[PDB]
Design a protein around this ligand. Structure first.
Ligand SMILES: Nc1ncnc2c1ncn2[C@@H]1O[C@H](COP(=O)(O)OP(=O)(O)O)[C@@H](O)[C@H]1O
Ligand SMILES: Nc1ncnc2c1ncn2[C@@H]1O[C@H](COP(=O)(O)OP(=O)(O)O)[C@@H](O)[C@H]1O
Lengths: 224, 224
């Protein structure tokens, strides 16, 4: 099974928008796809339980028909760091459960995209971060970068930390979170020479519901 | 001369507000102080030339009477990355000039605070970053962290990168950039166990002009 972990340079850089574009491109290449969001906070109440919008986006951009709990085993209502609300609720986030869920998806999908929560160093308990699980699983990493002032620094910090952990940085995706601005081309050129991995594509600024937008065409899956 | 470099977890975390609080505390301890902002972009036109507001803040929180060019030798009008506007204007940012300016201040001040521009990895040319100069000068680093969601990840990334470069992380400052929110105490506890350096103090949310506020009392200079 090909498997990739998707992380972002900051909260709200469009990591889910880029994950839906990647899933769309993979579907278009003929893969049987599955999105996996093991941990999610910031969720709505429904008759069936708590449902997170990013996990719902991954669920319906998957080519397989998947149950929600398969896509997102840990769901918390409050939008804070997972280790805080996990401790508040008395519901430990277990590494074994996160890994069993990924194996379960590997029985039916041959292309699996794993989306983290927040940024690289999001804590899952007081002694365990998301980065620890990713390193354990030896997942190759795709970095999503929102093209804005501040992103050069954050992209460089994240890229260096992943490489220090002995992980493969598979590529990065540029996401245009704002309208056309004055130094867009120079930011793209700087980011391209400084991130030691191929740029997989750039998603334009899309004003209406970009998660449901057909964005697979912006991704060149041949560089992965 | 004691010398410290101040960096931030993200643009606009209050790195200048915390620098003014640090300068105020140092003045109160009896040091002859000087703030130094070698590179600045985002500046106003005046009869005397371009003047940057952060450098002006450092200039009048210094206990010595200093000329502006002494505090800020490189001033650019456009608020973008220094390497872009430096290249546009044909005005190279020279490491020798940045270091000569710091020595000039060391002839009259015995406590010097150096403020960077942007975050840790801000490029000054295509082959040279701010981090390269700080490592060259062997400056101890103070990290300013805005207490918000996303900051745990960014504080951990910056702290790890500084330590990998063989530099001393002297301490960190918590800056409350927003009003009292629901998980403030848990964010402060997480940040305190994860940053490998002493918390020097916490600056509260101050609605009016916090650069001119008397904030030295929030800093415990004895931990530096
Ligand atoms: N390309 C884009 N164009 C317009 N809005 C975007 C784009 N990418 C992200 N956004 C918006 O930014 C917000 C966060 O996006 P999301 O994909 O959920 O990021 P993250 O997974 O990092 O939290 C959403 O409102 C989303 O619609
Ligand atoms: N403690 C605070 N209370 C209220 N506003 C703050 C506080 N700290 C920073 N700000 C505001 O945030 C903005 C950026 O602050 P600044 O010190 O210049 O940060 P930076 O040097 O990282 O750019 C300014 O408008 C500043 O007044």
């Amino acid at each position: 099974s090909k498997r990739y972990f998707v992380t972002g340079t900051d909260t709200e850089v469009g990591k889910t928008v880029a994950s839906c574009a990647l899933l769309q491109a993979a579907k278009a290449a003929g893969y049987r796809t599955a999105g996996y969001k093991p941990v999610a906070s910031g969720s709505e109440k429904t008759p069936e339980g708590l449902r997170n919008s990013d996990a719902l986006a991954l669920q319906r951009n998957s080519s397989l028909q998947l149950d929600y709990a398969t896509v997102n085993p840990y769901t918390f209502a409050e939008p804070t760091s997972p280790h805080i609300i996990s401790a508040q609720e008395g519901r430990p986030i277990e590494s074994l459960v996160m890994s069993a869920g990924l194996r379960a998806l590997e029985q039916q999908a041959d292309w699996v995209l794993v989306e983290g929560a927040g940024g690289w160093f999001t804590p899952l308990s007081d002694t365990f971060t998301f980065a620890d699980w990713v390193t354990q699983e030896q997942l190759p990493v795709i970095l999503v970068v929102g093209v804005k002032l501040g992103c050069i620094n954050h992209a460089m910090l994240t890229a260096q930390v992943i490489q220090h952990a002995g992980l493969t940085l598979a590529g990065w995706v540029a996401n245009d979170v704002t309208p056309p601005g004055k130094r867009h081309a120079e930011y793209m050129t700087t980011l391209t020479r400084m991130i030691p991995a191929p740029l997989l594509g750039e998603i334009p600024w899309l004003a209406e519901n970009p998660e449901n937008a057909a964005t697979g065409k912006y991704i060149n899956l041949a560089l992965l």
